[PDB]
A and B are shown apart, each in its own frame.
Chain A
Amino acid sequence: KAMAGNFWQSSHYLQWILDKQDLLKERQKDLKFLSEEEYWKLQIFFTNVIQALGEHLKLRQQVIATATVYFKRFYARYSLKSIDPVLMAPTCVFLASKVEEFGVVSNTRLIAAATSVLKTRFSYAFPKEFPYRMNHILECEFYLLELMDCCLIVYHPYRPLLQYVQDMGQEDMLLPLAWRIVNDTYRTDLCLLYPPFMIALACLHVACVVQQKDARQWFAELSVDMEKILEIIRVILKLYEQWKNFDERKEMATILSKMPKPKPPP
């Protein structure tokens, strides 16, 4: 796959690994309307929306992941009021599918998927039908591309995870769970803050702890900053407590009504 060994000279590494404090300062704009708690709940929710759009379109996890990252990059800089995240989400899938060499997903099919997924899987959050046409997707796509400074190649933890479990010789034991935990990390800021192989390593550590697999020695033989790995582990562990305590289905309509609203023209 294109650019696989080039992470260290990549636009992802050089432009889109962010300072955590810079991230939170830009987030203060939106925190006048939403609590910290409600902001992370929106992020989880739209992560699930993108997942559902992706599954419905029969795209691979990597396409969904790239789409998810585009959505996060945009709202890392800009307010939730700037473009409707209900529009941005299917725009991010659409653009990602063209990068990742699957195809220009039919317009009628993109619009049908968004309509169908919100209706069937997300009616708790949305009473009204998906109201955007393709010309809105097309407009949004230009704004998305401009904001990301045309940075489209994104690197994810799946590839290094696979190399690590092959190395361990435990692809059967740990890969299913570790992969699932990598999926779950997309519910957080981790992909904006850490190189992918580090998220891979943290997910694999947790998978081993969940399955009572002793990998101390294998992890000890890595030449990696273990404090950063532990930071990632903590965020994963807190994510599962957040998940336990969150009823997405009962809370999201209310939280979506608290979002700041795109100002109309005068």
Chain B
Amino acid sequence: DDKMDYDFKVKLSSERERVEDLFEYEGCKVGRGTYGHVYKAKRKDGKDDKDYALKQIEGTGISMSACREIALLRELKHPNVISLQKVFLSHADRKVWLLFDYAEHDLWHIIKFHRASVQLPRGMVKSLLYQILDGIHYLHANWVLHRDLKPANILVMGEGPERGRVKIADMGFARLFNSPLVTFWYRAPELLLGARHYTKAIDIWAIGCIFAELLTSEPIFHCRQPYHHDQLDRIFNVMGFPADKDWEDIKKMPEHSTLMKDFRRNTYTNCSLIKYMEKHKVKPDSKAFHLLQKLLTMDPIKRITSEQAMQDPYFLEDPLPTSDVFAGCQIPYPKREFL
């Protein structure tokens, strides 16, 4: 600007910490996606030897996603939610960088390692679930929805002070009018039926999906590439078709008459969560199963909340959850490959 004060401008330019002077991250890219570019980085002044994650947000300037991600992360503080350490605004190229502590692991890679075979240890699974629930409860208590929960957004810290601690990452930033209108595996039936807003219950559905995926190593609602027919078909092949009594307000959903046109109850008559989970060697009289079933309730008003799930007697049955998901045992999962 020509009508901005020169002294003010050059003073700020002199003091401005630039990402590329502070951090070595050249060719250390670990993620590329709709989030943007995520690098494993090191501080160039050798003050600390910690690993950091540097995310360059997709796009330039201050978009809604960018604006709201910064706004919320600046306020949110909980052990199970990823902490924003610093924000770099690069003035030349109008790029926003965000700094986080580096999480060596995540549930996409952990589950896929187990699926490459050893099923996930039962102690670790419960601890993962407890910390996901703890983190989501904190977000929900603050009226913050994630809106995109899935294994790849559940980070787990590696060796260092926070060994085996879940960090929930990349909250669904953002959605215009809080409205949803290629992965459909973690989406609640009501979204698939044309629900017009995200809710706490939608997050809770995703958590049940994750929990089932931890117990079996298979995504419970795996399906091929709003209303998606085959995704709904898969839910019903697992869960059965909901009776009128199980989900009374299903008639209120915008895509309900489409569901009636395309589907018949009788197709899914010998289908239930019980029979699915028994084929994957999980007992239907287990506290695990009973908790899972409450999470995977079809009618969103009959799904338990995060707080009720944390109170579940599953977490009082031996073994107790631990702060370190790996329970002091050696971590067999490989470190992140660079791109």
Contacts and interface: CB of A to CB of B under 8 A. Distances in A.
B62 interface: yes
Contacts of B61: 138, 141
Contacts of B94: 138, 142
A146 B94 CA distance: 13
Contacts of A99: 67-68, 71
Given A5-B142, A150-B74, A152-B70, A84 B62 contact: no
Interface in A1-53: 1-6, 9-11
B30 interface: no
A82 B64 contact: no
Contact of A98 (B62, B87, B178): B62
A107 to B, nearest CB: 11
B142 A84 contact: no
A224 B215 CA distance: 51
A140 B9 CA distance: 11
A266 interface: yes
A173 interface: no
A143 interface: yes
Interface stretch (A160-168, A197-205, A244-252, A257-265): A257-265
What interface size band does chain B fall in? 20 to 34
Contacts of A142: 62, 89, 91, 94
Given A95-B62, A98-B67, A103-B176, A84 B74 contact: no
Interface string A96-139: 00110101100000000000000000000000000000001011
A149 to B, nearest CB: 8
B317 interface: no
23 contacts: A3-B72, A4-B142, A4-B143, A6-B75, A11-B74, A79-B5, A83-B5, A84-B4, A87-B1, A98-B67, A101-B68, A103-B176, A136-B1, A139-B1, A142-B62, A143-B12, A145-B70, A145-B89, A146-B16, A262-B3, A262-B6, A263-B5, A265-B2
Interface of A: 1-6, 9-11, 78-79, 81-84, 87, 95, 98-99, 101, 103-104, 136, 138-143, 145-146, 150-153, 262-266
